[PDB]
Amino acid sequence: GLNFPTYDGKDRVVSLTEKNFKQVLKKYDVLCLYYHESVSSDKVAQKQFQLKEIVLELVAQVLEHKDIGFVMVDAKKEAKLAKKLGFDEEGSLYVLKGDRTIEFDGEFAADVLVEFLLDLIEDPVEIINSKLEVQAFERIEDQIKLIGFFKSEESEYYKAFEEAAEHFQPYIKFFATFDKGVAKKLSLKMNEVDFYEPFMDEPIAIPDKPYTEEELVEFVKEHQRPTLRRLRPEDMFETWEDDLNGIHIVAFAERSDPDGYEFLEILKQVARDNTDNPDLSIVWIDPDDFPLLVAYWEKTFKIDLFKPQIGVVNVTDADSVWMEIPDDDDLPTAEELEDWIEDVLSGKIN
Amino acid sequence: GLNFPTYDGKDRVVSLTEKNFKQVLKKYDVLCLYYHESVSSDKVAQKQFQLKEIVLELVAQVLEHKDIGFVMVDAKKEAKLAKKLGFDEEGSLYVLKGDRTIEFDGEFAADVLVEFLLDLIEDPVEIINSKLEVQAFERIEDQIKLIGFFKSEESEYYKAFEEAAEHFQPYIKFFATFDKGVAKKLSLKMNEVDFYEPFMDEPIAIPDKPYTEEELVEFVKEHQRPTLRRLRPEDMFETWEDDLNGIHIVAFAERSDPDGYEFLEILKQVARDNTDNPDLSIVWIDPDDFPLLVAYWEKTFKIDLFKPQIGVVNVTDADSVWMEIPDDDDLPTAEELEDWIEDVLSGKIN
């Protein structure tokens, strides 16, 4: 009687062609498009694509009716109906929806994608009214999140807020409320929006309310790189290119293993203490979310990931300089961690 | 292909034949075997095998630096070997550590399998050398654990605990201490073992002090069904196949959705009371642990898994029954719960 999403074997990721084009884009609400080009029976390349293709048919199965559309676009055949779609570089997974095209960076894995797609499908702004609502919003701490108080769903400034929201889906969170009490509690004024940078207590208030679409958007583009940020799988790839200065100050910490949890609660202090520093952005990778990679990192970095760590790694010529506290050592604290971060240049360009 | 890493298309899982059976056996510590059907008789049954194949090719890539061998054995071309290896269930992933053959009845994913295998390459009895380490021994609530005080490794009573331990890897955790100080904290007389069932308050001592391998294997088997068993990805299937007379009293509750926490805590206390009840075995499923499945269950289970819930999903006839449609957000008492279960359990469900 069915049971469990164990792949069917079936074929749901069809290929776009100028033939079907018409009727595919106007058959589906969201349409997920993976642009590629596969070389001969270069079994490596065939095996490398076969993974991606399988992931998509399993995502396609999980979300069969929900109505997203899963297609394939080749770069040697169908290369003009691809530039007549926008697709500037091979291998990427695009999604067309509020008609726009979200670029999906992030691990190519079916569970990730399903969550991704199942967020684009919902609308950009989540509205709050109750205590479990306001409390579940007050819960998110590791995602950027903007909340704004408005008059109505038809508030012309609310409508600017939802339009700004679209430019950032699924990755950033916009929420609104119309209820007066909720806003008393969350300390918002009328048409005012508060910006919560992750792992800081305080929300910075977006200045000089009411705001324009383009003002809200400018701000979220200004404040988009938090002082400490989590390496989430939704966007793992996007944050690994958002280079701070050529490097990444990376910090590992398992937030269950109590040396790691503890190491984290220090990490947020340096983060709260050095917010307005432009040049300091810490990516925290909880090793428990990245198995595959834990092995790879542990070995190309010359550290023990089953312990806490924080170092500098250059995004280009692959070497790292870890605060290996060089025996191994068991410490730190903020004053000691800031000073080593502050000193990364003595451990660099002198 | 350039990211941080992906899957190199290369071919690591290799086919097992008698021509090389000796050579690879006396070559790896763990051998991981996929016992499959045949080649291609009907194509969309070769798509599913490519799911099962592309995963094993990725697991093998990550765990390359490990002493694990990934091999496939064909039920048709090699029926000599499968008979000597003891493989009869086509479609199965078996691993071989020593003279023990371990079947994987879990969610066939590359992350689940990297977890499973790493936990299997490990030594089966975990030694607690210090009071300190005891506090972490007591962390584990949702898994069956056994601890024993033995005079040392060298003793026949540890020897044959270690042997009982390998029958059950990696599903049931076995620990051991040889410090008198740790023993007095856990309360074990010399050569005394304790069985800790998930979610209960005290242990069950294993009774006729001391034991042999098959005296221990017989007690675990005898008490290895918990009243509140947590559904896990590493053994999910194995759990669903073990019914409690056709049905399954299934319970949803997200452990961090605070209601889910509070509902789980009353689930544990009804289970703590009716622990005595032999038909009763509640499977709780943290929905945040099963994404693709929350979508599956998002068509047939019309129910709302963001909320608490509990009911009788019938394995045999594909249907399902849930807790009351009066039952609102009004979260039950321990008392109300039992009360729901006994005329379901005993009487017609309704």
Swiss-Prot record, chains A, B:
Self-association state and partner proteins as the record states: Interacts with ASPH. Monomer, homodimer and homooligomer. Mostly monomeric in the absence of calcium. Forms higher oligomers in a calcium-dependent manner. Dimers associate to form tetramers, that then form linear homomer chains. Interacts with TRDN.
The family this protein is said to belong to: Belongs to the calsequestrin family.
Gene3D superfamilies the record matches: Glutaredoxin
An example Gene Ontology biological process: regulation of release of sequestered calcium ion into cytosol by sarcoplasmic reticulum
Gene behind this protein: CASQ2
Tissues where the protein occurs: Detected in heart muscle (at protein level).
Calcium regulated hydrophobic site: region residues: 200-221
One CC-aspect GO term: Z disc
Role of this protein: Calsequestrin is a high-capacity, moderate affinity, calcium-binding protein and thus acts as an internal calcium store in muscle. Calcium ions are bound by clusters of acidic residues at the protein surface, especially at the interface between subunits. Can bind around 60 Ca(2+) ions. Regulates the release of lumenal Ca(2+) via the calcium release channel RYR2; this plays an important role in triggering muscle contraction. Plays a role in excitation-contraction coupling in the heart and in regulating the rate of heart beats.
Organism domain of life: Eukaryota
Glycan-linked positions: N314
Location relative to the cell: Sarcoplasmic reticulum lumen
Annotated source species: Canis lupus familiaris (Dog)
InterPro entries documented for this protein: Calsequestrin (IPR001393), Calsequestrin_C (IPR041860), Calsequestrin_CS (IPR018233), Calsequestrin_middle_dom (IPR041858), Calsequestrin_N (IPR041859), Thioredoxin-like_sf (IPR036249)
Pfam families, sorted: Calsequestrin
Protein name listed in UniProt: Calsequestrin-2
UniProt KW keywords: Calcium, Glycoprotein, Metal-binding, Muscle protein, Phosphoprotein, Sarcoplasmic reticulum, Signal
GO molecular function, one term: calcium ion binding
Positions of post-translational Phosphotyrosine modification: Y261
Effect of K185N: Creates an additional N-glycosylation site. Decreases calcium binding and increases the rate of spontaneous Ca(2+) release from myocytes
